[PDB]
Amino acid sequence: DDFAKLEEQFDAKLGIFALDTGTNRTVTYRPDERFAFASTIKALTVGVLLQQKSIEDLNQRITYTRDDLVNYNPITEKHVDTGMTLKELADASLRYSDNTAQNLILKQIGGPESLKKELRKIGDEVTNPERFEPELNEVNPGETQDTSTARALATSLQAFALEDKLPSEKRELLIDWMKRNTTGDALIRAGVPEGWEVADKTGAGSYGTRNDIAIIWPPKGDPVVLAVLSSRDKKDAKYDDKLIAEATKVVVKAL
């Protein structure tokens, strides 16, 4: 079918789960196969952070040093000498995919184990967070550490952004940051028709892993929850964003 043809054109494996929350119609393809979640986990991490912290708590200033910095710190590496509030760290993790911001947030909620417990509480029995950034991207075939599935990632995102795991105000908070993400212009955003609103979180890992999860709103209709995951067989393989955009067109077309 259309998705298998894409796996052939891009020589990659596709993980897809899409749910029209207004009709319960879905689009799936290897919906339950595991993939390294990479940075998409940052969205669920802030979801759990919003569960534990009040809006007032987010103003708490977090200080750190040049050594706390990891490999990809676009925003945090510019505020070492002044620190950043939790709200600012959440903005940089979600919108710029800042790795240090995610680590500081993760530390705030109790580490990867606490994140797992909380996801287990909301019904997510698949996602398996174990490490910090950027080590969590080091996932080899057959391993479940730091992996999840399209269905589980989409469902958990749905839980925090559309359900009731968070009160409306915090919901809107999460959605607005994601709506203003800066890293997914060539992914899900490039596969939906004009007029469609997208709130997404991207990811990239070893084995050419390239993912994007989002909540997309048609100009007319209820929101669609979508997770498009992918990986390749070479550990050092390069990914092509076009695969995600195309897969998204197929999903929009089918729905």
DSSP codes joined into one string, the chain:
-HHHHHHHHHT-EEEEEEEETTT--EEEESTTS-EE-GGGHHHHHHHHHHHH--TGGGG-EE---TTT--S--TTGGG-TTT-EEHHHHHHHHHHH--HHHHHHHHHHTTHHHHHHHHHHHTT--S------TTGGG---TT--TTEE-HHHHHHHHHHHHTSSSS-HHHHHHHHHHHHT-SS-TTTGGGGS-TT-EEEEEEEE-STT-EEEEEEEE-SSS--EEEEEEEE-SSTTPPP-THHHHHHHHHHHHH-
Task: Name the nearest CA neighbour of 205 among 45, 35, 38.
Answer: 38
Catalytic annotation, pick one of 7, 8, 33, 39: 39
Give φ, ψ of 227 to 5 degrees.
Answer: -130, 125
- Rounded-to-integer distance, Cα 104 and Cα 132, Å: 10
- Rounded-to-integer distance, Cα 207 and Cα 227, Å: 18
192: its two tokens: 């939906």
177: its two tokens: 């940051």
Largest CA distance in the chain: 54
Q: CATH no. for residue 160?
A: 3.40.710.10
Question: At what resolution in Å was this solved?
Answer: 1.8
Residues 6+ apart with CB under 8 A from 167: none
Q: Is 130 a catalytic residue?
A: no
- For the range 232-238, what are the long-range contacts, defined as Cβ-Cβ under 8 Å and sequence gap of 24 or more? 232/11, 232/12, 232/13, 232/207, 232/208, 233/11, 233/207, 234/207, 234/208, 235/140, 235/206, 235/207, 236/206, 237/207, 237/208, 238/208
Catalytic annotation, pick one of 113, 114, 135, 246: 135
CB atoms within 10 A of CB 23: 11
- Rounded-to-integer distance, Cα 140 and Cα 122, Å: 27
Total domains present in the chain = 1
Going from the C-alpha of 22 to that of each of 63, 97, 165, the distances in angstroms are 44, 30, 19
Residues paired with 148 in a beta bridge: 35
Q: What is the CA radius of gyration of the chain?
A: 17
Q: Is 39 a catalytic residue?
A: yes
Residues paired with 204 in a beta bridge: 210
Give φ, ψ of 45 to 5 degrees.
Answer: -65, -45
Interruptions in the chain after residues (C–N over 2.5 Å): none
> Which residues span the domain enclosing 119?
1-255
Tokens 């209820």 map to which residue? 222
Do 63 and 79 meet the contact criterion of CB atoms below 8 Å apart? no
Experimental method: X-ray
Do 229 and 15 meet the contact criterion of CB atoms below 8 Å apart? yes
Question: Mind giving me the DSSP string for 32-48?
Answer: TS-EE-GGGHHHHHHHH
Give φ, ψ of 197 to 5 degrees.
Answer: -90, 135
- Rounded-to-integer distance, Cα 54 and Cα 50, Å: 7
Going from the C-alpha of 206 to that of each of 37, 138, 145, 213, 214, the distances in angstroms are 11, 6, 13, 18, 21
CA atoms within 13 Å, Cβ hemisphere of 166? 27
Residues 6+ apart with CB under 8 A from 87: 58, 59
